[PDB]
Amino acid sequence: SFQGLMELAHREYQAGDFEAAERHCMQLWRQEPDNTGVLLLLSSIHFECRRLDRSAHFSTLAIKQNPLLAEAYSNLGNVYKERGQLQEAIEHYRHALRLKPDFIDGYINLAAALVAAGDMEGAVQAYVSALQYNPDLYCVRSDLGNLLKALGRLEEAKACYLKAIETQPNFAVAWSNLGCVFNAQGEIWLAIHHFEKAVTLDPNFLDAYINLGNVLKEARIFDRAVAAYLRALSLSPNHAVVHGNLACVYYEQGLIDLAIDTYRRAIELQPHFPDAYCNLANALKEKGSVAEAEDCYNTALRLCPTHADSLNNLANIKREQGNIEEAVRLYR
């Protein structure tokens, strides 16, 4: 606190707040302008709170006092990353991991910068160098896995996933990503198993529930998909895509009225959404209330002229009304 190593601002950073920490570091750097990692704390605070150029300025001060500290370069590169100059970040990441060749987190930041830029293999070497430095950073191993899967080199990406899994069995994300890999390959039941394992290890890993329900309705195992989707909704109530999938499951189950209701909820959630329009109008027409089927189809076709399914359905209706010239044009 007073007349000591007042790491209390570090404690507030752990809390994530700024105010008392921010004034505390102000007071520090007019009482101990001796450490600069405190100024790095300041730049970091400005970073998360979107005080960008203030981060930059305090980083530049860090560059005065010891331009030998790679981490000022790291933060400068982060700044560049969210302000475009990614190449300069990359060369800074060179510079940093030349200054501290056995530094990990620089690898991670430069790998993110790389994947933003578009050079995969450099990022591969980033991650691999991280690993040969540390065989225990299972999270970066999963990141490896995501990148490799993005490169479609499936089997060894799955192998990295498994290595992380055995590295930390209690881990959760790796299970879901592995399940994604299997679902990509086609061995769906393995994927269902993996996703169930993931949600068992954590009832909060929402996207796992999304994937699980998605692949369940993929294989027409309806009721389990319903349960998974409802769990997802409880975990997060307010986005459309899950509502659309859930409502499609409802409709193919037969509960057409609930399908109408849930399409309505989805549409009101996200307006610019042609597919719910089309499916909802299908369910309406199959329920008999035509007079709004064409209305919804028109709304969809207005939103997207290219949405062919809506064209086919509306032309089917107008064929029912006999406007064959119009229907033929729509078919064309």
């Binding site: 990692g37 730049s43 970073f47």
Partner: peptide, 9 residues
């Protein structure tokens, strides 16, 4: 990920 460095130095 900034450092938020803690070091005696």
């Amino acid at each position: 990920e900034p450092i938020m460095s803690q070091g005696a130095a």
